[PDB]
Design a protein around this motif. Sequence first.
Motif, PDB file in Angstrom:
ATOM      1  N   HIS A   1      42.817  56.035  41.983  1.00 52.72           N
ATOM      2  CA  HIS A   1      41.816  55.839  42.999  1.00 52.72           C
ATOM      3  C   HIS A   1      42.009  54.526  43.729  1.00 52.72           C
ATOM      4  CE1 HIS A   1      39.122  52.980  40.448  1.00 52.72           C
ATOM      5  NE2 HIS A   1      40.389  52.719  40.211  1.00 52.72           N
ATOM      6  N   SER A   2      40.859  53.841  43.977  1.00 54.14           N
ATOM      7  CA  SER A   2      40.676  52.429  44.207  1.00 54.14           C
ATOM      8  C   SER A   2      39.234  52.278  44.650  1.00 54.14           C
ATOM      9  CB  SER A   2      41.601  51.789  45.264  1.00 54.14           C
ATOM     10  OG  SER A   2      41.507  50.369  45.239  1.00 54.14           O
ATOM     11  N   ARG A   3      38.350  53.136  44.086  1.00 55.75           N
ATOM     12  CA  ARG A   3      36.913  53.021  44.126  1.00 55.75           C
ATOM     13  C   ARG A   3      36.401  51.751  43.516  1.00 55.75           C
ATOM     14  NH1 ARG A   3      33.801  53.430  45.937  1.00 55.75           N
ATOM     15  NH2 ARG A   3      34.692  53.698  48.091  1.00 55.75           N
ATOM     16  N   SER A   4      36.995  51.302  42.381  1.00 62.79           N
ATOM     17  CA  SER A   4      36.509  50.182  41.604  1.00 62.79           C
ATOM     18  C   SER A   4      36.499  48.890  42.386  1.00 62.79           C
ATOM     19  CB  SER A   4      37.292  49.979  40.287  1.00 62.79           C
ATOM     20  OG  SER A   4      36.632  49.070  39.411  1.00 62.79           O
ATOM     21  N   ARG A   5      37.531  48.647  43.228  1.00 58.34           N
ATOM     22  CA  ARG A   5      37.584  47.482  44.083  1.00 58.34           C
ATOM     23  C   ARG A   5      36.515  47.550  45.150  1.00 58.34           C
ATOM     24  NH1 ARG A   5      42.840  47.566  45.593  1.00 58.34           N
ATOM     25  NH2 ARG A   5      43.501  45.989  43.986  1.00 58.34           N
TER      26      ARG A   5
ATOM     27  N   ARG B   1      33.589  49.436  45.341  1.00 58.00           N
ATOM     28  CA  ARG B   1      32.221  49.468  44.870  1.00 58.00           C
ATOM     29  C   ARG B   1      31.667  48.099  44.587  1.00 58.00           C
ATOM     30  NH1 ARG B   1      31.748  53.538  39.959  1.00 58.00           N
ATOM     31  NH2 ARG B   1      33.360  54.665  41.254  1.00 58.00           N
ATOM     32  N   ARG B   2      32.498  47.192  44.016  1.00 54.89           N
ATOM     33  CA  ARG B   2      32.140  45.824  43.720  1.00 54.89           C
ATOM     34  C   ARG B   2      31.947  45.020  44.980  1.00 54.89           C
ATOM     35  NH1 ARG B   2      31.131  48.173  39.613  1.00 54.89           N
ATOM     36  NH2 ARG B   2      32.599  48.194  37.770  1.00 54.89           N
TER      37      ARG B   2
END
Lengths: 92, 110, 108, 51, 104, 69
Positions: E5-9, E11-12
């Motif tokens: 993904h790269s949701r984690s970057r 969302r923060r």
Amino acid sequence: MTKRTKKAGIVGKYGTRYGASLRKQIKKMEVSQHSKYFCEFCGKFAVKRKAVGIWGCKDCGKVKAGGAYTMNTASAVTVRSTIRRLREQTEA
Amino acid sequence: MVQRLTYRKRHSYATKSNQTRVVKTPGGKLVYQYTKKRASGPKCPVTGKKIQGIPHLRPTEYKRPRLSRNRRTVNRPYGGVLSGPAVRERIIRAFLVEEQKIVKKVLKIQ
Amino acid sequence: GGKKKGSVSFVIDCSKPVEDKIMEIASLEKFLQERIKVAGGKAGNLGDSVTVTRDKTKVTVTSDGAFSKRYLKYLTKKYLKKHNVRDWLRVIAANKDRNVYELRYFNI
Amino acid sequence: MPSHKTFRIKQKLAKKQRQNRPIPYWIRMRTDNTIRYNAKRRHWRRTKLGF
Amino acid sequence: PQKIHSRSRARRAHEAKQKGRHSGYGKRRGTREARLPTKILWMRRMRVLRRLLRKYREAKKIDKHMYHDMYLKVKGNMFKNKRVLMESIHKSKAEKAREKTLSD
Amino acid sequence: MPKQIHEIKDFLLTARRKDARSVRIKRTKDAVKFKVRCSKYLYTLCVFDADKANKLKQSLPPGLTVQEV
RNA sequence: AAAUAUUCAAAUGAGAACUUUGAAGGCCGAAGAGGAGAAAGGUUCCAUGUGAACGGCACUUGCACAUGGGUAAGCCGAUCC
RNA sequence: GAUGUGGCGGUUGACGGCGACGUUAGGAAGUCCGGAGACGCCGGCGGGGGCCUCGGGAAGAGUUAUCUUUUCUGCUUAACGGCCUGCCAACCCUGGAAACGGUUCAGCCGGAGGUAGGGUCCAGUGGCCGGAAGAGCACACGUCGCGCGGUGUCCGGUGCGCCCCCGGCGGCCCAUGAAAAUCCGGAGGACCGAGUACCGUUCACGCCCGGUCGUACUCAUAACCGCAUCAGGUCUCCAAGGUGAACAGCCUCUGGCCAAUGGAACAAUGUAGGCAAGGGAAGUCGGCAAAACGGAUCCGUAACUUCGGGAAAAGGAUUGGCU
């Protein structure tokens, strides 16, 4: 008011363009397009321009003939008055 | 991608009659289906406003079908045709003309 | 308030290829040390005391803290490869099989 | 839409597809002799078929 | 599958716009009104305030007369926020209360 | 299938007809109920109570070829 | 010589930088080099056979050549208007 | 198209409901009239669906020196039908308003009766049930194999998000934005109405039937058109995540290629891309393009002008990480 000296309608539309003489005629006839008028029938200040030469009152639903830009006209007053006078004298 | 939508039948242009709405299958897949255009209002001729008490659908639905007799009509005269407050206006006109007419006729002869 | 715990009893199952097919004391031993390690020490979402008893070939941890649910499946993944080349010798299921957890929750 | 459905064109496509077949070996003996190297076999990528 | 993904970057970063931050002129500015058009914000002033005032009159905490003037002032945008209006309502009630006791 | 009915009598009258039937008893589900297949349309009667449900299955006409499923 | 770009091992075969499979590196970057329909072409789709010509390199591979098969509608279109 | 069974109708052609209108039937010849088929474009707004965001929860996957209750992923529900349900628009009834009200992007509701109270209607849509898990999806186990036995597949949240639809509005015009098949309604009341039957047969249920032709596949840096596996051209639908206004660029997901003849040296010279001290258009017909400015927030803003503008004039300052 805000950044308004006189008023415009169509002066603001142009930009720099068109000219001072040209706006005089059309400003008068476009304010007339916007202009609320009183119905003969209901008496409310409803009547608005349906189309060219056509006027419609929203509330009572009455549709009326008139001038292109304006409800009536100076010419319209003259024409009706002479016809009514001639009718009145002859019928006698 | 995102579950894609394509012209599902034939006719590959985005006409008014082939405006579409997306539907999700039990497969979990998105496809649009052909939906007929949303109905207007049937008008009352004098007022021009929508006619109450009448469901409005495509003419195909609105003719000899699954629908019962009632759904095409309102019980009153000019049921689908005139609005109801419009109907009474013409009953009033009918009343006024007949009563006035006898008064006019007797006046003229005398 | 009341009783809130997360009571997970840890089951060790023998299934799947990647070595032999065996059990071991070490799997249940690893469960305790890592639970205390990750949960304990925190400014954040938990705060707990860890209580443990050990059954015949199951270690059961009841902790006065967080849940026992989604969280416990997530934590077990972490335990696998931090130490010990095995794991792929368990992760069966169908039913609540594997390590069965019972969540005690406060009433609301 | 279809992919021009009209029968008059459709029959010609069928006929020409059948026509675009190689000459069959045997007949070269049963002509006497004369190099029967067809000619009416065409390929789609080159030329164009008129209707 | 094939990578991740790269949701984690993302969302923060969104959570760091949920919590103030990084909203000086430089990074935060593309073309002028387009980030949130401001027309809707002006309508939001009309909508939030008119619900509060309407709720007050129909529940009866203010009189209809108090509502009438206040509604017209909301159109003028003499109150820009939820508060400042609150003081105005209570002030209006108090002035009319002082008037009423004087009248009786 | 288009219709769910709750009237036992209505179901029974259809059930005597030649057309067909199928019946489902399984876990507590949307699926479980006594189904009567009439030719164009299908009426479904959900008997909630287990004892009454078993009796309904027993009431089924012997000549009709009802599917146990 | 434009289009960001290949590489390694294995399989097969007489023969493999190019086929095919894995591994790896990338690329288009969702107004796509995408999944489909129109129009157009007409069997090109796919299997199997397979390198005489042809794919301006190569080649066992091909949208090539040979040999087979494949398009099924009361409800989609045409039709009807 | 056939019909038979039930019901509909003896007040002969249904009632109930204040009415708006409700419902399994509830005559209807010639004829009439209306409405439906049936309508522009733009703007903002409403609601819906899907997609996006996110917590809990049940399964499998990854990180997993180290740290992280972290990360990823499956979690689905149709056409069609039942029951129930929509606000704006509109309409009915109550009531009788001045300290006049509600209310639009145009002043429009109410003075031919409002605000307010209670109803009614259009049924987009959602709900729950039927469809319909018997399906499908994710797991475990089995080779008991062209397939075996079991589960689990749930419950919330958020909005200037994205796309599309649908609703009712508003702007526009010396521009005012089709027609027909298809088709029901009402008005019309002739004619035909019976009882042990005749009438309804726009109702429900049951029985049969539905002809003609097209459907391969590509849809393009290789199946089309340019002699052509041509960097060109060629109508449309779907449109993830970040940064950011972005359907911009860049990076990536998902889907798709890895074939752009390959290797070596990588000279001058080209072509394409960068950078240069000090000077700064002196070059040159000419600032041609390279280059610089650039986004935004704040401040500041000219002689002049058809007063609308110039105007983002000029000119400056500011802009992070994190807490």
